[model samples]
Every structure is written in structure tokens, then in C-alpha cells.
Target chain A: DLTVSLIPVSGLKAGKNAPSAKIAKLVVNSTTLKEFGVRGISNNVVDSTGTAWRVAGKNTGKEIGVGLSSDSLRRSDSTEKWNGVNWMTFNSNDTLDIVLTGPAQNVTADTYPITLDVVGYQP
Target chain B: GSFLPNSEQQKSVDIVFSS
Candidate 1:
């Protein structure tokens, strides 16, 4: 059994522009037979930064920050489910990019809180 | 059989094993 946490992940900024908005790249990784599964993901946009969503990514690449309420319209594929049914899986061999984007609809220092509940069990 | 997301967004985004 393996336990995973998101706090250990790092955040990166693009240019030098703070237009009351932000973008980030979150690269979720796995090591060894250290495979993991994400059963639950809770995104909390603690502030009113309008809406946040993804901008189309690849099976490779990385993840960047920005989002809205978990139940908001922007919480589409990036939610807990992928096929609109069962839970998603995170393996211990590839990369998962979660790009978060948000615009300050007149707000500043928008806070994006991401909570992940992970599990790892080899068969 | 290949495992994939049962949605349109699956092509643009896919979850895999990362190191």
C-alpha cells in the first residue's frame, strides 16, 4: 500500500505578468512499482477569480494552475471522473498534467486550493 | 484492447503512469 500527497508538488509561473490572473503546470508523477490511483480530487478556488479551466494538453507535457468552484462549469474532465462514470486511475509509469488557469474578474491574489485523495495497491 | 476515456476530451487528455 502506498499513500500519495499533492503538497510535495512544485509550481511554476510563465512570464512576468500578474494581471490579477495566473497559470501553472502541475506534473503528477510515479516511481517504481509505486503506482497510485486518484479516487477523489477537490479543487477549491478560495477566492472570486472568475472561472478557471484547461487549454487542451497532450498525453505528455505538464500541469499548470487556475480554477473555480468544484461544481462550476469549468470542472469538466478534470474532475473525479473521466468517462462520466467510474473513477480515474494514475499509474506509476507515466505523467499526468493538470493545467489550471483563471482570470481575476477584478479580483487579486486568487487562491487555488487542490485537494487529492490517492491510493496505491499492486495486484 | 486499448484503455481510453469514454469521452471526447479523452484524445486531448489522458491519464498515464508517470515517474
Candidate 2:
């Protein structure tokens, strides 16, 4: 069992009493997966808020599952959603938590540094 | 089997979740 931790040291914090928000997507670029290693990318954005927790496997090289809180739902607009490019907003003061998992591979064991480029737009 | 000295089989799996 290998552990990968993504600490939310800081994020784009909205105002107080924020409604709902959406995570546009998670962009991954890895060079460790070369010379018989695999390179992968994901665009699975979700509607939730807070910090993200991700757990990866060592053999399967795939993500197993993810868990989050309901409080994350109160960060955006009613019609706010991810349209592949922009994250439509519904409120303010909303924070989001994201989690990703996959079957563990050679590169999965090391501490992989990931960056999330979040864009916020009006609902 | 196609023989490529520098090429090898690469497999990858990815999953995503939201809260």
C-alpha cells in the first residue's frame, strides 16, 4: 500500500456565504513514465469543495475510489457546471476538494507533483 | 512481434472523483 498526499496549502478563496462551485479539471504531465512507462491525463471535474484525498494502488496502476463531504456542494451556483473549459460559478466563499486514484505503477510510488489550474466564471 | 529496440509496451490507468 503506497500513500500519495496532496496538501491544500492554499487555494483561490471566495467570499463569505459562498454558494456552489465546480472544479474544471485536473491536468497531469509526467516524465517518469518513459521508456516503457505510460503517460495519462484526466478531465474528470466534480462539484464539491474542500481539500482532496487521493489513494493509488501499487500493482493495478489505476485509481480505486474517492470520498468527499457534502459541505463541498455549497460553493457554486445552481446552474454552475464544468463545460470542459470554464468553471461556471453559482456563489462565493466556496472551497473545493479533489481526489484521484489509479493502479500503482513504477512512477506512482514517488511523490508526484501536480498542479491544478482553476478558472472561475459567472453562472 | 514488431521489434523496436527503443520501443516497449506502455500501459496506464487513471481515475478521478469529486466531493
Q: In order, what is each prediction's RMSD in angstroms?
A: 21.4, 21.2
Tens-digit lDDT track of model 1 for A1-123: 443433323453333333323232223454544444443243333332223333222333333344423332332233233345333344454434333344323212223344444444342
Minimal lDDT window, size 10, model 1 chain A: A48-57
lDDT of each: 0.36, 0.31
> Which candidate comes out best when scored by TM-score?
1
The DockQ values of the predictions, listed in order, are: 0.01, 0.01
Error of 2 at A16 (Å): 35
Fnat, 2 decimals, each candidate: 0.00, 0.00
TM-score of chain A of each: 0.36, 0.31
TM-score of each: 0.33, 0.29
Chain A TM value for model 1: 0.36
Residue A38 Cα positional deviation in candidate 2, in Å, after optimal superposition? 26
Residue A34 of model 2 has an lDDT of 12
